[PDB]
Amino acid sequence: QCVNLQLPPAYTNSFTRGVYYPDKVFRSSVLHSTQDLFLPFFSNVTWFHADNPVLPFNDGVYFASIEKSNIIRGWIFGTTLDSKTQSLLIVNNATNVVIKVCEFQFCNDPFLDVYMKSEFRVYSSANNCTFEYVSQPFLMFKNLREFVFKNIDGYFKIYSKHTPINLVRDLPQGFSALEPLVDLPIGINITRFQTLLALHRAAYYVGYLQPRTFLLKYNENGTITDAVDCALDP
Amino acid sequence: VQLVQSGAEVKKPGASVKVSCKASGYPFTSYGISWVRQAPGQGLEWMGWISTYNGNTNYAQKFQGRVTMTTDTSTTTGYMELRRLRSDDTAVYYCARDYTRGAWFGESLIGGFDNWGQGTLVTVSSAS
Amino acid sequence: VIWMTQSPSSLSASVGDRVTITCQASQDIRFYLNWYQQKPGKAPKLLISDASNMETGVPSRFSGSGSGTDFTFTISSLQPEDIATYYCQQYDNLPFTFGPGTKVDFA
Amino acid sequence: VLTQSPGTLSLSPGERATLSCRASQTVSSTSLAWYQQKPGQAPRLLIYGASSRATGIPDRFSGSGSGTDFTLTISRLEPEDFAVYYCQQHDTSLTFGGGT
Amino acid sequence: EVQLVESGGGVVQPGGSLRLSCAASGFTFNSYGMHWVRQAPGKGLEWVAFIRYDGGNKYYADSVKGRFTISRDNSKNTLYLQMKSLRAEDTAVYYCANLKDSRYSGSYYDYWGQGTLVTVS
Amino acid sequence: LSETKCTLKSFTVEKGIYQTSNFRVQPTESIVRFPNITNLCPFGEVFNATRFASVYAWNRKRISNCVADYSVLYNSASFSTFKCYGVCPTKLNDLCFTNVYADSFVIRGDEVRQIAPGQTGKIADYNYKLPDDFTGCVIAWNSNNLDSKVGGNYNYRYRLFRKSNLKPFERDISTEIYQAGSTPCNGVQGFNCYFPLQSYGFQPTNGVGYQPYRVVVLSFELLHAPATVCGPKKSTNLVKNKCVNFNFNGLTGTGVLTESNKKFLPFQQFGRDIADTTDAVRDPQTLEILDITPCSFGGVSVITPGTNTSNQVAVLYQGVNCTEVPNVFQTRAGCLIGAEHVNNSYECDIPIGAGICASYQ
Amino acid sequence: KVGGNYNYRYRLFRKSNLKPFERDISTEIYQAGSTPCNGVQGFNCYFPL
Ligand SMILES: *[C@@H]1O[C@H](CO)[C@@H](O)[C@H](O)[C@H]1NC(C)=O
Ligand SMILES: *[C@@H]1O[C@H](CO)[C@@H](O)[C@H](O)[C@H]1NC(C)=O
Ligand SMILES: *[C@@H]1O[C@H](CO)[C@@H](O)[C@H](O)[C@H]1NC(C)=O
Ligand SMILES: *[C@@H]1O[C@H](CO)[C@@H](O)[C@H](O)[C@H]1NC(C)=O
Ligand SMILES: *[C@@H]1O[C@H](CO)[C@@H](O)[C@H](O)[C@H]1NC(C)=O
Ligand SMILES: *[C@@H]1O[C@H](CO)[C@@H](O)[C@H](O)[C@H]1NC(C)=O
Ligand SMILES: *[C@@H]1O[C@H](CO)[C@@H](O)[C@H](O)[C@H]1NC(C)=O
Ligand SMILES: *[C@@H]1O[C@H](CO)[C@@H](O)[C@H](O)[C@H]1NC(C)=O
Ligand SMILES: *[C@@H]1O[C@H](CO)[C@@H](O)[C@H](O)[C@H]1NC(C)=O
Ligand SMILES: *[C@@H]1O[C@H](CO)[C@@H](O)[C@H](O)[C@H]1NC(C)=O
Ligand SMILES: *[C@@H]1O[C@H](CO)[C@@H](O)[C@H](O)[C@H]1NC(C)=O
């Protein structure tokens, strides 16, 4: 059962944020050059308060949230966002992450209704399902959760990182790389997406990736600790 | 390739019988298991089919709700259970290796029941 | 690999009896086959090579014949000293292979 | 539904045998099979896919057909060829004929 | 006159290694290719490996290939078999021999040693 | 000395030190390490299907988490076409992949040539497109005895009309009307308005180029992930601290293997050096990380007085320990064999290196 | 020939491929399985030509 529950955008600086491991090959004590879809340094990132509009996916998305109450549970990714096309639904619950691809007939304003007990008010139908996956929760001081979403050659790739944070209405400075989380052989187009929030009877940030060349510093332990965005300045 | 089954059994009406089917000499999970019944002097009657790979099943309309099939992949053995036994269920129950349906996709194949077992005779008489 | 087999696995016979042992190759090995006799506690001794060629010093009561996959070893008149296990070995293609061996008992 | 004829085929050894199976509905040639059952023994597959010989089956056996009419033939009956034969289809559900 | 003498046998543990040797005399060792053959207790003969007269080309059975190595020293008239990653199944009497062969070794005469027992435990 | 004479291509050699050859430690054994997969891949259920899909709506079957025997396919006499790109079918039997996809459909014989990378035509453009860098094998056979009918088998169809060519691995099953001119259709067939799909005339009496053929295309992908598909595999035990030949999940090479201190993350299977060579792997059964270093090697130099003075020589094994070589002295230049080390000092005669010189006394 | 000219034959079965310029005219029985032939044609025993 669906329930029927625009503001000017706020922006923040992504100083050195959103770097992820470009591949799964181990490297150490080396400076490695790579070309991929990355979030440009010191870009203008859109800031929202959990205000949950449908956004364009473009070439991929950097997503981050700061919360202490697990309000952001998941996302909807797709094109038409109706039964006319296959859409990707990613949700987290108390025990698992649940991922489905179907001709979902989504609600006009989808959310998860919380009483401990919860009920999904995301879609009215889920016909012709093509893909399903279940595992341990993605996400599970404040908690800073960062994700990168890419859709290349039919593969939907997710990278992520989780740290504490003691800062307030903004993203932290300093370097942190996001590790691969999952790689799903889905084979669908994505052009639009939306956040899924748990509402009872937090804030998030959205930046877009661009084709950029980076120089990545792998330390002696094989972790990326620094980077240069080659197109930023001379 | 060899398939073997349990020995003959006698049951009273209303009871149930479980027939085993141990198989060897082939990649067990690559082939499904089929079951066929034959009452004395009668022709062959199909009961159902089970996939040894994923446990998917298909049953003949006369046995739906009466027959349950299960597979043990560690002992390479199939089993079939028939409930609510009747006197007219007195018959030999045969287990065979299947190539009429795929084990992985469940699609119809060009083939038949390639290898059969000895058959298990089940008698359903109230009198001992 | 060319596998070798023998038949029977064992036989019982008395002195003066004719003893026939069959050796078969998994594939055509022409006439290239060695016949060995082994008694307990000892290394094998060659009796016949190239299917039919008798080894020097071997009694005339022993013979053999055949070709391709099919070879036969014969003792025309068994003696009490002939109680042993007989093996047939193909040397046509490496790796070389011996048969299971045929055991002869004294009846 | 599958039906076979004749119910009993009376022939001497050394003679050529022909057995028919017919269908109530069109059956794909890819989804038909023939079996043989000797007295006191389980059935064995002789032909699959309408015209394909099963493993270990001698050249004496062959078959053909399409649509709603299929045939099993034996070029010459040997003492071991005297048995009950059944036709099967799995194009729709799975059914067997009455046997001959 | 012709003699073949195996040595280096004994008892070893599984996963271990053992070096066997066979001294030769009374014949032109350096002229012949040489074979190794083994026989487990109560079992028939199993061909193990062959090496050519020059110590060049080497051949192995599938049961030992990748684990065992065959070699020789024509100045010391000695044949060797180096076994690694030994298993219980390798328990057998190992013999060195010059097997009569008209195709590969060119041997006219057939000679065998006394054998050496190897036990894996 | 003879090797020195041959190296210098001369029967007389002057006093000095000469590099004549390179030594290399050979592999003591060969080890193979493949994934522990118990199920065989469902290839039989792909090729012996009772019914096959049309070319416009080609069917995709994913093969994974299994062992694959291609020896039954390549050596089969039942196939009219068996063309592989980027790989040899005889070598495919010991390779590993992250996924294998089997694309299956029915076409006419004359269209079989269109099932290949870089091709154009009605099928290549509007029904089934392969990429220019396609890796895998195209398998096809005549099915006139199965897919043809006396009155024609119009159950199989193909796309004749489209606005543009398909991208690789696209599948379009739209049945809407194509407008061929400038005037619109109203969903109604007519002048310049045509239904996009056409049927094939499949009769058993048709010529070879017109008869139906069943096609299976095997697409092979190897992403950086635990292989889910491997050919017939015979695995061996793992050996360390010795020079060995190895095959890890299809990756072949030679070197010494040891436990690694490299902190691999769970998704990582291997590392690489600046030469693009692999220098660390994850064992596909134990998940242990191993270091890979090639086996000791280096130059061999012969030290000699002139052959007009003596035929005696000494040999220097450059860069190695004396313990690894099979009057033995370990210099910083390597292991020197055949020379007597003394505690005296003289003017340098034949230079060895690192303060060490040799002479004939 | 109208009734077929079976005077010409070819080899169908062999243990391994021939080396260049080899000529093999053996007519002995090929064993295709694991059980031997006795020089006798039958199951897993086929005349090579
Ligand atoms: C929400 O709006 C849709 C569209 O008008 C309507 O069909 C649906 O019934 C509404 N839901 C509720 C609870 O009113
Ligand atoms: C989370 O989702 C999984 C998969 O649908 C389900 O089995 C599990 O019970 C769910 N957990 C809760 C608390 O609902
Ligand atoms: C799946 O999609 C097809 C059209 O491609 C449609 O006809 C069918 O009804 C859909 N199935 C369901 C359950 O909605
Ligand atoms: C997906 O994207 C490709 C490439 O632009 C396009 O050809 C195809 O029609 C799209 N399919 C869907 C369902 O959007
Ligand atoms: C690398 O890891 C070691 C522990 O294994 C740690 O002592 C060292 O400080 C780390 N180096 C860096 C730059 O973090
Ligand atoms: C020749 O034999 C002698 C012993 O008589 C041995 O010392 C020498 O090394 C041998 N040379 C060769 C090349 O075998
Ligand atoms: C299809 O079935 C036949 C008969 O069982 C077999 O010969 C053929 O190899 C099978 N094809 C595949 C790919 O398994
Ligand atoms: C091998 O099998 C073991 C269990 O016996 C399992 O833990 C391991 O992950 C398997 N390896 C692979 C690559 O699946
Ligand atoms: C070679 O040795 C002879 C003496 O045997 C000597 O006279 C001659 O000068 C020497 N040649 C050279 C180049 O030293
Ligand atoms: C190799 O030589 C070095 C000195 O150069 C020594 O420290 C090391 O212990 C030696 N290795 C062995 C096995 O002797
Ligand atoms: C050289 O001197 C060392 C002690 O510094 C001694 O151990 C060695 O034996 C001496 N060697 C010779 C040839 O005098």
H or E stretch covering F145: helix F144-147
CB A227 within 8 A of CB A216: yes
Secondary structure letter of residue D72 according to DSSP: E
Looking up tokens 């949700």, which residue turns up?
A91
User: What contacts F267, CB < 8 A, 6 or more positions away?
Assistant: A24, A179, A180, F225
H or E stretch covering F6: helix F2-7
CA D96 from centre of chain: 11
Query: Resolution of this entry in Å?
Result: 2.4
Cis previous bond, C95, omega within 30: yes
Distances, alpha carbon C16 to alpha carbons C47, C74, C79, C82, D42, in Å: 20, 13, 7, 11, 49
Q: Does F contact A via 3+ CB–CB distances below 8 Å?
A: yes
Can you tell me the distance from the alpha carbon of A105 to that of F89, in angstroms, rounded to the nearest whole number? 46
Neighbouring CB atoms inside 10 A of A177's CB total: 18
Can you tell me the distance from the alpha carbon of B65 to that of B70, in angstroms, rounded to the nearest whole number? 14
CB C104 within 8 A of CB C85: yes
CB D12 within 8 A of CB D99: no
Distances, alpha carbon F320 to alpha carbons F246, F296, F313, in Å: 24, 8, 19
Q: For chain D, what are the domain ranges?
A: 1-100
What is the CATH number for A161? 2.60.120.960
Å between F215 CA and nearest CA of chain E: 38
> Which residues have CB under 6 Å of ligand 8?
F 35-36, 226, 284-285
Quote the strand ranges of F59-135, DSSP E: 59-63, 66-67, 81-85, 96-97, 99-108
Secondary structure letter of residue G42 according to DSSP: B
Looking up tokens 């620094």, which residue turns up?
A226
Express the helix, strand and coil content of chain C in percent, nearest 5 each.
5, 50, 50
F-chain residues within 8 Å CB-CB of B103? 42, 45
Determine whether the interchain pair E61/C95 forms a contact, defined as Cβ–Cβ distance below 8 Å.
yes
F-chain residues within 8 Å CB-CB of A26? 262, 264-265, 268, 270-272, 280
The DSSP string of B38-83 is: E-TT---EEEEEE-TTT--EEE-TTSTTTEEEEEETTTTEEEEEE-
Q: Using CA atoms of B18, B22, B28, B34 in order, give the dihedral in degrees to the nearest 10.
A: -50
Tokens of B104: 């992985």
Q: Does domain B2-124 have CATH number 3.40.605.10?
A: no
Tokens of F147: 């897919």
User: What contacts B73, CB < 8 A, 6 or more positions away?
Assistant: B28, B29, B52
- B contact set with F (CB within 8 A): 27, 29-30, 53, 99, 102-105, 107-111
Q: Backbone phi, then psi, for F203, in 5-degree steps?
A: -115, 145
Among A20, A26, A132, most F C-beta atoms within 10 A, so best to mutate, is A26
D40: left (phi over 0), alpha (psi -120 to 50) or beta: left
Å between C105 CA and nearest CA of chain E: 16
User: What contacts D20, CB < 8 A, 6 or more positions away?
Assistant: D4, D5, D69, D70, D71
Q: A135 CA distance to ligand 2 centroid (A)?
A: 10
Q: Does G contact C via 3+ CB–CB distances below 8 Å?
A: yes
Can you tell me the distance from the alpha carbon of E70 to that of E88, in angstroms, rounded to the nearest whole number? 20
Determine whether the interchain pair D28/F145 forms a contact, defined as Cβ–Cβ distance below 8 Å.
no
Q: Mapping DSSP to helix (H, G, I), strand (E, B) and coil, where does residue E106 land?
A: coil
Count of structural domains, chain E: 1
In terms of residue numbers, what domain contains E19? 3-120
- Ligand nearest to the CA of residue F330, numbered in listed order: 10
Judged by a CB distance cut-off of 8 A, whether residue F29 touches chain E is yes
Chain C residue at shortest CA distance from E93: C43
The DSSP string of chain A is: ------PPPEEEEESS--EE-SSS-B--SEEEEEEEEEPPTTEEEEEEE-----EE-TT-EEEEEEESS--EEEEEEESS-STTS-EEEEEE-SS-EEEEEEEEEEEEEEEEEE---EEEEEEEEEEEEEEEEEES-S---EEEEEEEEEEETTEEEEEEEEEEE---SSPPPS--EEEEEEEEE------EEEEEEEEE--EEEEEE-EEEEEEEEE-TTS-EEEEEETTS--
Distances, alpha carbon D62 to alpha carbons A110, D39, F237, G43, in Å: 64, 22, 51, 19
What is the CATH number for C21? 2.60.40.10
Ligand 3 atom with least separation from CA of F173: 5
Express the helix, strand and coil content of chain E in percent, nearest 5 each.
5, 45, 50
CB F29 within 8 A of CB E64: no
Q: Backbone phi, then psi, for F122, in 5-degree steps?
A: -60, -40
The residue whose CA is least distant from atom 3 of ligand 11 is F343
Looking up tokens 């009668």, which residue turns up?
B42
Nearest-CA neighbor of E52 among E82, E31, E25?
Answer: E31
Determine whether the interchain pair C28/G15 forms a contact, defined as Cβ–Cβ distance below 8 Å.
yes
> Which residues have CB under 6 Å of ligand 3?
A 127-128
Tokens of A118: 């919860």
What is the CATH number for E72? 2.60.40.10
Q: Mapping DSSP to helix (H, G, I), strand (E, B) and coil, where does residue D8 land?
A: coil
Q: F51 CA distance to ligand 3 centroid (A)?
A: 21
Can you tell me the distance from the alpha carbon of G35 to that of C27, in angstroms, rounded to the nearest whole number? 10
CA-based R_g, chain F, Å: 33
CB A27 within 8 A of CB F276: no
Tokens of D23: 């269908």
Å between F143 CA and nearest CA of chain D: 11
- HSE (CB half, 13 Å, CA atoms) of E18? 23
Nearest-CA neighbor of B54 among B35, B25, B33, B81?
Answer: B33
Nearest-CA neighbor of F97 among F140, F31, F32, F41?
Answer: F41
Tokens of F308: 């007009």
Give pairs for A19-22: CB < 8 Å, separation 24+. Answer: A19/A175, A19/A176, A19/A177, A19/A178, A19/A214, A19/A216, A19/A224, A19/A227, A20/A148, A20/A159, A20/A177, A20/A178, A20/A179, A20/A180, A21/A159, A21/A177, A21/A178, A21/A179, A21/A180, A21/A224, A22/A216
Neighbouring CB atoms inside 10 A of B99's CB total: 24
Determine whether the interchain pair B30/F38 forms a contact, defined as Cβ–Cβ distance below 8 Å.
no
Distances, alpha carbon F114 to alpha carbons A214, F55, F202, in Å: 41, 12, 19
Tokens of F347: 């003017």
Partners of E7 in beta bridges: E21
Can you tell me the distance from the alpha carbon of B121 to that of B119, in angstroms, rounded to the nearest whole number? 6
Amino acid (one-letter) located at C81 = E
In terms of residue numbers, what domain contains A76? 10-234
- HSE (CB half, 13 Å, CA atoms) of B48? 22
- Ligand nearest to the CA of residue A97, numbered in listed order: 2
Tokens of A39: 């979030």
H or E stretch covering E48: strand E46-51
Using a 6 Å cutoff on CB, does residue E74 contact ligand 6? yes
